[PDB]
Amino acid sequence: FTPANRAYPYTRLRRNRRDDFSRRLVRENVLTVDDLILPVFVLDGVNQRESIPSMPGVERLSIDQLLIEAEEWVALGIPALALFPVTPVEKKSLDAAEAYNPEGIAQRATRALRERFPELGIITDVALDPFTTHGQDGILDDDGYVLNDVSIDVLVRQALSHAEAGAQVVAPSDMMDGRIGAIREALESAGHTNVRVMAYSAKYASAYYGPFRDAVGSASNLGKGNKATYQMDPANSDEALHEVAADLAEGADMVMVKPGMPYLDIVRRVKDEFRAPTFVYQVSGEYAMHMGAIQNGWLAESVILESLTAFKRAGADGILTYFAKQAAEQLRR
Amino acid sequence: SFTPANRAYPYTRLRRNRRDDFSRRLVRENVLTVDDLILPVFVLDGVNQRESIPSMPGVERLSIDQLLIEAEEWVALGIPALALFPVTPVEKKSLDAAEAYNPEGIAQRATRALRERFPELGIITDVALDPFTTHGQDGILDDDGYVLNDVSIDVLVRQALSHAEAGAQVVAPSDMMDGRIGAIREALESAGHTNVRVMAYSAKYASAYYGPFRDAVGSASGNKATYQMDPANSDEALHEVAADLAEGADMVMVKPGMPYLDIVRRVKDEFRAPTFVYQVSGEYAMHMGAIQNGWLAESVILESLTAFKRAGADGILTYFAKQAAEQLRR
Amino acid sequence: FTPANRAYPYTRLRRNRRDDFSRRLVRENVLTVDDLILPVFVLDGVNQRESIPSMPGVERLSIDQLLIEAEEWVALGIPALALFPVTPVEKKSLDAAEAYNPEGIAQRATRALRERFPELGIITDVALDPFTTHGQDGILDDDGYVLNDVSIDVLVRQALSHAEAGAQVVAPSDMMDGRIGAIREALESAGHTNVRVMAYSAKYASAYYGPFRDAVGSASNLGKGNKATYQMDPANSDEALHEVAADLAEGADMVMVKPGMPYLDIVRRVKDEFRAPTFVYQVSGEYAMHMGAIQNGWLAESVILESLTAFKRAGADGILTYFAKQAAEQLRR
Amino acid sequence: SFTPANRAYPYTRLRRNRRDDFSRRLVRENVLTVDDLILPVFVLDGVNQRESIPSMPGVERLSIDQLLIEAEEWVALGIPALALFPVTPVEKKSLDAAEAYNPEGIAQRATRALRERFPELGIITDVALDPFTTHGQDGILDDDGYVLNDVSIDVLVRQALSHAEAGAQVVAPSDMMDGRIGAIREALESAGHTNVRVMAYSAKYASAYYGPFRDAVGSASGNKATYQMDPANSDEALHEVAADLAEGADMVMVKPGMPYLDIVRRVKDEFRAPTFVYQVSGEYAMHMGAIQNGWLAESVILESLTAFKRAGADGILTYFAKQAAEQLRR
Amino acid sequence: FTPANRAYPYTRLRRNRRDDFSRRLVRENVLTVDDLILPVFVLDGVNQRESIPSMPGVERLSIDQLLIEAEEWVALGIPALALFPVTPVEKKSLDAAEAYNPEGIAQRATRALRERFPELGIITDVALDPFTTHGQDGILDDDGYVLNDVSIDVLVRQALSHAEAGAQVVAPSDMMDGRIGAIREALESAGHTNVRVMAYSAKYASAYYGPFRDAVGSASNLGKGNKATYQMDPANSDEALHEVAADLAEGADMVMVKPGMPYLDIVRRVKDEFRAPTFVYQVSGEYAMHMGAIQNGWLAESVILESLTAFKRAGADGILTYFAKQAAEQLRR
Amino acid sequence: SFTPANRAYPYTRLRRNRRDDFSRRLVRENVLTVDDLILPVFVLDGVNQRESIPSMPGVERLSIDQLLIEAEEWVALGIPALALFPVTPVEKKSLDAAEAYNPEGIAQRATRALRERFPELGIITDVALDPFTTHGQDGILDDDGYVLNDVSIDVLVRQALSHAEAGAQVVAPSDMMDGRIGAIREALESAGHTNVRVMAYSAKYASAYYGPFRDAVGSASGNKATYQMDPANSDEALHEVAADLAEGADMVMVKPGMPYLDIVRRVKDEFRAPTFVYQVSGEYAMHMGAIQNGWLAESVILESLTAFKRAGADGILTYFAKQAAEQLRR
Ligand SMILES: [Cl-]
Ligand SMILES: [Cl-]
Ligand SMILES: [Cl-]
Ligand SMILES: [Cl-]
Ligand SMILES: [Cl-]
Ligand SMILES: [Cl-]
Ligand SMILES: [K+]
Ligand SMILES: [K+]
Ligand SMILES: [K+]
Ligand SMILES: [K+]
Ligand SMILES: [K+]
Ligand SMILES: [K+]
Ligand SMILES: [Mg+2]
Ligand SMILES: [Mg+2]
Ligand SMILES: [Mg+2]
Ligand SMILES: [Mg+2]
Ligand SMILES: [Mg+2]
Ligand SMILES: [Mg+2]
């Protein structure tokens, strides 16, 4: 960068801050509804709405209830939903076969939403964690290690069942090496030419996933287990560039940094280095922490749009956020 | 900077994101909002007057009362700022351009009237001598017909001060005299006008695109290649901006607009400062003419304005600002 | 960039502007006839010259009339023509078979010009829009979507018929993914080793194509249809770099940004990043808008060379411009 | 800068290094140590006083004797520095903010007491007028309610000098007046306070995250968008830091912290200077609230602090500093 | 870099140096035990401990003695050992067959350590120099030249016997072209998916290897021979970038610069350019030279941590150092 | 900067160029020549004296007549410059370091004697107070034992002037006081010493490697972390060099040498200025000790010196300069 010899008092950076109109003129970034993705927790059955104690204001919804709520999500202009099925306990297995069940919640919810709301983007989740008795994102070997290439075999079948259900976007969150190219290849081979792959590229072994694990019901399955053999070390930044570079090479249409606010520097570096469609997840713990402080009267509602503007400023094109309705509503007005 | 990352067809198909509206909206790199818009307005001396301009279809010169009336609609649409260009009566032109610093000149009157009735509306005054000289040249001429640099700056400074006294939040020197940004900043600071912004017309080309504006303001009674920039020069625009930043400009502008998008892009990339671009009278008329003739669909207006945002402009001075602001509200 | 601490009054940038001679010495870019490509609209039949109301001063020309006009284009030193055939209504089809007809206007015009003017560069257009009843650049599926790889099959046959006719350059304007490498491969396989591919790399879904659509007669076919599923979003800049990077990798000899003046920042970035032979189209709407303002007395003729100098300054090596004769004439003198 | 080097699955499997603790530790790019930690502390006027703060669970305001007692534990843990924030009695607030430079103001007293009993402990004083004004604004107001720049700097300078006289090794201007770093540096040098460090709050955003701190210090009886930075602006933070470095800052700070990691990263990459970040009261409370509610595991605290190191911060002002220092000792 | 116009006396860089606390706050790099790899010389037989005259304080150790010493290495938190077997004279050959003996010292020591200390990283050495009668790192042709691809055949068999013994890391020190990709391929083919390859990427034809050659017993075998046809020319820096780029492309998980302190500029460039896990060897001559000066009373012990901090500052993530115990002990306290 | 160009085994085999001496010589990136060499020499007060130094095997302190005798051999070998380090008699040390600017101090005498008998030989004097203070500290101490910055600069300036008067072509301030390069340059210019070069010891670390030199010069009767650089810091060295260049240094130096090659590399890459590196007494002794012990072959000396050239140094201050110069002649 070139400072161009700017010096007080010839340069006073408060002059542009003097008035709202100049503030607005020079303002570098804005959040719009075109930046918003709403994740939703999807229940089996009919007429089901379940509160989540660790994500106040967020509800698990059966497919019929989801179709009704989606009327307003669409009316607000929200471009896409990311679906997270809440797997019945009895459907969890060692082999995660429910992942690719054409009658699984994810697949049924896709078919229903694609028919009801043809313009709404549906992003499915490619990962085994909602389907395994152990709560890990893949298949274990006899050492209890998440097998890479064997897991990809199952993830591929899943991705294909999502495309078959009409999902415009599949989002592998699993963090297996090479899964973007394996899923891309399979989609291509099968004629699913236009199904986007939204890679979770730099997805960290984070402590901020707690509430979501309660929400999808994987928390009791995982127990004290951790994902440090596949999810990325929080301390590592350069390594995120290698992750993204491979996912681009492998065919990803979009690349994602996960967690969001605790990793904004990663967003910045990924946008700067690759100049590709860049996505960020404002995860369940980020949401819970803001919502808990707002409900306590400790922070003003306005932190919501402040937290979301940060993602734009950092370089994200789109934001998966549990705040997406609240935000769209505030936008809107 | 830029890494292809070994992206290769068919693994990479750049049309997947284009497949649907929802994914095009998600990845869409830039968006024009009314926050980006500045409306230039031509201001008359009388009351209850509007005049049409043959080379600027749909643009009216307004007397100050009409300006106030119309500004109600501009403010309602959320347009942040106006850029005022006085249409000087012939009796008020001189070799000394004294009308430039007249506390009752059209720009000064318009400014006080606007600042009082719409206190949140940004007013950007024009610092230049071309509406005030008998030959309309942007400065004072010597005996060979040359536009004197430092002597013109003395008049421009008096002018900028009069604008700051009239209440203008921004003065915009468009004259292209060397060193004027610094001289104006110095004088503003010495006079205690600490918060008056200076929007430098930094890289302002010796263009053929200003023709309609010259009819608009009545300056059309000659070239400016000794002060305005040679259209061929790009590296040069970086030196012009570096100086204006060092001299204290709060925002820097590239002029003409669309014929110079590459300059917007270099200026934003290199300096990372508030960057402005003028979509000039000639751009406006070309587009407007083609639309009215039925040659071009009217969506070319948002396409042109969108181009400014993509090239790196923060704000756009454009005669389209009202039309664009209405399309963005609808 | 390094400002090197240059400060008024030690640095006065008006000193070089003082005199024509210093102006000329430091002037960074110049337009010459070596930068000019003339597009031409080519009619069937004999002795045909048709005015285009939305492109004043431009005529559709039968092949005999084109050969006569070309005498002066060559005398002026214009390096190349880009041919755009005006397809008879009765020859438009679903399958676009006329694209690869050895007796199609494009093919006949190539053979005639290559024989008459052996040094003149002939650039043919690879695209189905002049041949389809729907006016879209490729073959539609049952959803009315432009099929990518199926369209490339037809585009390849077309490119081959152009090479067979003697075209030194083929210019795929179609914006299908991967078509540069498919056309390159086919040309290579068939022994057309030296046929250049001039890729329309970063070709935007623009509103500035109106007059050309009237000129080639595709406007009534297209109707209200749009090309947003293949032509690029006007808002997108980083994405242009990915487009060009792939076309280079795929074998393009030249890469083109289209529209021209509304996308000069793209020209700048493409030249800066790739350092490759870079081309820009000053499209029909750009031409119409300048010509309409000049005829109205609103702009001086001099905007023509100003608009063309911009392309040089921005980084283009060559410019496809309907002004190419006027410009060459003004150069010339 | 960055070269992918044609790395491709399966030759490249980024999980191999993740396979085992030993290889994760070897390649681990960043590590938080107590060397990175600064504890902000809220200081009361009395003796034998502690108060709890509703919006800052687990944080106590301490009178100076309690501060000394607690500092024994902070020093033992190896915490390098405290950042003092006085809780000004209501009787001591004024329009002129004179209490700011009172040689017996809470900050000044706390500093002398600390410098004497823990001479190796770093004391960072707050240079700002918001704990001293009746309206708590960070400067002196004019008649339209505007925070006067240069007039406020005059008071900030008197304040910084009083801190240097009290023995402070670092004064930290948090006020966001233009040019204050230079004016403070000039005055420090003229007075022979050659080694007093200035830690500029350089890119300090007009944030909603300061709510709990305003309760903590008692300033909660209004916005600061005319001086604090617009949250949307990034390029702007580079200009703010460039000026503060030129003006003589020894370290530069980004504030808020985690909602601005991208700014930490740009600031460190571009300037390669000592870079500091404040994990503000709102960050602390959000995390603390979620942990106590059972929503988040307490390892999110080290994860947040680790994020600062990775983003490029050298030092972190954080209300978590004692907790983190104990986890690093255990 | 941007100096930002910093000028004395407004900028005095001694202000941060004034006090220990500010020193500590701004200190850019720190050595920790997570950066340390201990190389060890491994003897055949039982109850063997042999001093090395050119590496004072370093001992060759039989496997039983190595298991006992390793108790404290682990207690100190040292992440990994690099094993260097001391080949019996009678086991040296033309064909280096002992390299891949499942009962070779390296293989036996791996199996023993992997079983006794499951969390300790074991890095094996892939190179023929401890096994050849000539002391060169590969197989000679009839001109006495080290054959590239023939040597790789043997190195591959070795690497495989190391994986089979349970080594988590193999470190080819041989400097044959292409050996990283050959070893990677073989490991992959054989299902050794997670065995890391720590490439000696920019390994110089150095004079600083003397003491180690005495330690492993290769010095008398090598004689006056040199390795200039494979080990890198000390004068060459740009060439190191090409070396590393290829090893990354070929699948290395970590890349190493060798010697350490005489090549810190190489460390800096490799980290800066590639942003990959970067390793550096503080070689036997570096160790001997510091230890000799410390024992003579010519340098303070404190040069040890100074020499090791240099590697962190230069850009290394991990350091193979004979000082690793001393350092860990000093850390520790 | 760096493009791998898709080079891949077996098309690319980097050993082909290594196959033969002739191709290794052709591609060989750097070469040490005697043009790169500066010999530091320890100078005694007497006549007909040489002393051995226990921690610096093979290095002798020489009285000025012995220096002249030996310099005949250094000049013949083509060594461009000496760096003089006086061994001050105990009687000549003081709190005020006055012996530093004594026109008959050892450095000053040695310089006149050298400039007269070998007028083409470069003489680099040491600007520092550590050979002259009773506590040997590089400056004047205040009452807390702190090395005063500006007060020390006053003495260093007097010293540098005395060297310029004695005929020195280069004065080399090794003291690490802030701002000294500028103060020395100013004083040299004011006194008409227009062509006297200043070789700044710019990035001079608080090292353990200076131990043998302290025995050599007799300063060994304490640390310098308040002025010499923290070994851990790299970005910091860029700021140190930027200042010294701005202040007028003709060449900039990194000290210690081999433990800081990464700093040489950053300094040359970023500033592209004449860059010097000191291979310090501790480096010399480590190498020398290992060679004599039979542990290392003597080719490690050229390897170490070659490393400096590769890292980006133009010139090397090295106690090996005579040995290396003889190997380069043979
Ligand atoms: Cl599809
Ligand atoms: Cl003002
Ligand atoms: Cl051919
Ligand atoms: Cl001080
Ligand atoms: Cl394995
Ligand atoms: Cl001189
Ligand atoms: K978006
Ligand atoms: K804007
Ligand atoms: K020229
Ligand atoms: K630190
Ligand atoms: K490490
Ligand atoms: K050579
Ligand atoms: Mg991955
Ligand atoms: Mg200028
Ligand atoms: Mg393409
Ligand atoms: Mg500031
Ligand atoms: Mg190699
Ligand atoms: Mg210095």
Short mmCIF file of N, CA, C and O in Angstrom, two decimals, chain D residues 94-124:
data_model
loop_
_atom_site.label_atom_id
_atom_site.label_comp_id
_atom_site.label_asym_id
_atom_site.label_seq_id
_atom_site.Cartn_x
_atom_site.Cartn_y
_atom_site.Cartn_z
N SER D 94 -16.83 17.13 34.27
CA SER D 94 -16.98 18.54 33.90
C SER D 94 -16.98 18.66 32.36
O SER D 94 -16.76 17.66 31.65
N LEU D 95 -17.29 19.86 31.86
CA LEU D 95 -17.27 20.14 30.45
C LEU D 95 -15.84 20.28 29.95
O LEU D 95 -15.57 19.97 28.79
N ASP D 96 -14.93 20.69 30.84
CA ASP D 96 -13.54 20.90 30.51
C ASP D 96 -12.64 19.68 30.72
O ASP D 96 -11.45 19.71 30.37
N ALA D 97 -13.20 18.63 31.32
CA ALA D 97 -12.47 17.35 31.54
C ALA D 97 -11.17 17.54 32.30
O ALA D 97 -10.23 16.77 32.08
N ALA D 98 -11.09 18.57 33.16
CA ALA D 98 -9.87 18.92 33.89
C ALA D 98 -9.37 17.74 34.75
O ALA D 98 -8.18 17.60 34.97
N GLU D 99 -10.29 16.89 35.20
CA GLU D 99 -9.91 15.79 36.09
C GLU D 99 -8.92 14.87 35.35
O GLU D 99 -8.11 14.15 35.99
N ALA D 100 -8.98 14.92 34.01
CA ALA D 100 -8.06 14.16 33.13
C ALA D 100 -6.59 14.37 33.45
O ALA D 100 -5.81 13.43 33.38
N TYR D 101 -6.21 15.59 33.83
CA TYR D 101 -4.79 15.86 34.08
C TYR D 101 -4.50 16.14 35.57
O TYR D 101 -3.46 16.67 35.93
N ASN D 102 -5.44 15.77 36.43
CA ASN D 102 -5.29 15.94 37.89
C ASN D 102 -4.19 15.01 38.44
O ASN D 102 -4.29 13.79 38.35
N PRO D 103 -3.12 15.61 38.99
CA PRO D 103 -2.06 14.75 39.54
C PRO D 103 -2.54 13.77 40.62
O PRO D 103 -1.82 12.86 40.96
N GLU D 104 -3.76 13.97 41.15
CA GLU D 104 -4.33 13.02 42.13
C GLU D 104 -5.62 12.35 41.62
O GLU D 104 -6.45 11.87 42.40
N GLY D 105 -5.77 12.31 40.29
CA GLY D 105 -6.83 11.55 39.67
C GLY D 105 -6.57 10.08 39.89
O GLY D 105 -5.44 9.66 40.22
N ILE D 106 -7.62 9.28 39.79
CA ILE D 106 -7.47 7.83 40.04
C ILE D 106 -6.34 7.23 39.16
O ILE D 106 -5.48 6.52 39.66
N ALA D 107 -6.35 7.48 37.85
CA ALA D 107 -5.29 6.85 36.98
C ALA D 107 -3.90 7.19 37.49
O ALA D 107 -3.05 6.31 37.58
N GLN D 108 -3.66 8.47 37.81
CA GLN D 108 -2.35 8.94 38.27
C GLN D 108 -1.92 8.30 39.59
O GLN D 108 -0.74 7.88 39.75
N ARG D 109 -2.85 8.23 40.54
CA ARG D 109 -2.60 7.55 41.82
C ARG D 109 -2.30 6.09 41.62
O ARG D 109 -1.33 5.57 42.18
N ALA D 110 -3.16 5.41 40.85
CA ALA D 110 -2.97 3.99 40.60
C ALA D 110 -1.59 3.78 40.02
O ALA D 110 -0.85 2.91 40.48
N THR D 111 -1.23 4.60 39.04
CA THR D 111 0.09 4.45 38.36
C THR D 111 1.29 4.55 39.33
O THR D 111 2.17 3.70 39.34
N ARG D 112 1.32 5.61 40.14
CA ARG D 112 2.40 5.76 41.12
C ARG D 112 2.44 4.58 42.06
O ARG D 112 3.51 4.07 42.35
N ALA D 113 1.28 4.16 42.55
CA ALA D 113 1.24 3.02 43.48
C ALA D 113 1.78 1.76 42.82
O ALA D 113 2.56 1.02 43.44
N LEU D 114 1.41 1.53 41.54
CA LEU D 114 1.86 0.33 40.81
C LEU D 114 3.34 0.36 40.47
O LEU D 114 4.04 -0.63 40.66
N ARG D 115 3.81 1.51 39.98
CA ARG D 115 5.21 1.65 39.55
C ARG D 115 6.16 1.43 40.73
O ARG D 115 7.25 0.85 40.59
N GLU D 116 5.72 1.88 41.89
CA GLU D 116 6.52 1.69 43.11
C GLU D 116 6.56 0.23 43.62
O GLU D 116 7.61 -0.25 43.98
N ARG D 117 5.43 -0.46 43.65
CA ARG D 117 5.40 -1.81 44.23
C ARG D 117 5.73 -2.92 43.24
O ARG D 117 6.10 -4.02 43.66
N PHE D 118 5.56 -2.66 41.94
CA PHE D 118 5.88 -3.71 40.95
C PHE D 118 6.65 -3.07 39.83
O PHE D 118 6.06 -2.86 38.78
N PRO D 119 7.93 -2.69 40.07
CA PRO D 119 8.61 -1.84 39.08
C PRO D 119 8.83 -2.44 37.68
O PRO D 119 9.13 -1.69 36.74
N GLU D 120 8.67 -3.75 37.55
CA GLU D 120 8.85 -4.42 36.27
C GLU D 120 7.52 -4.60 35.48
O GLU D 120 7.52 -4.91 34.27
N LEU D 121 6.40 -4.37 36.18
CA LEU D 121 5.08 -4.47 35.59
C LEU D 121 4.78 -3.27 34.70
O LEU D 121 4.91 -2.10 35.15
N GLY D 122 4.37 -3.52 33.45
CA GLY D 122 4.06 -2.41 32.53
C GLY D 122 2.72 -1.77 32.85
O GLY D 122 1.73 -2.46 33.06
N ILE D 123 2.68 -0.44 32.93
CA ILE D 123 1.44 0.27 33.17
C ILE D 123 1.10 1.08 31.91
O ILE D 123 1.87 1.93 31.47
N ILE D 124 -0.08 0.82 31.36
CA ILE D 124 -0.56 1.51 30.20
C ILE D 124 -1.75 2.39 30.62
O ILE D 124 -2.84 1.90 30.97
#
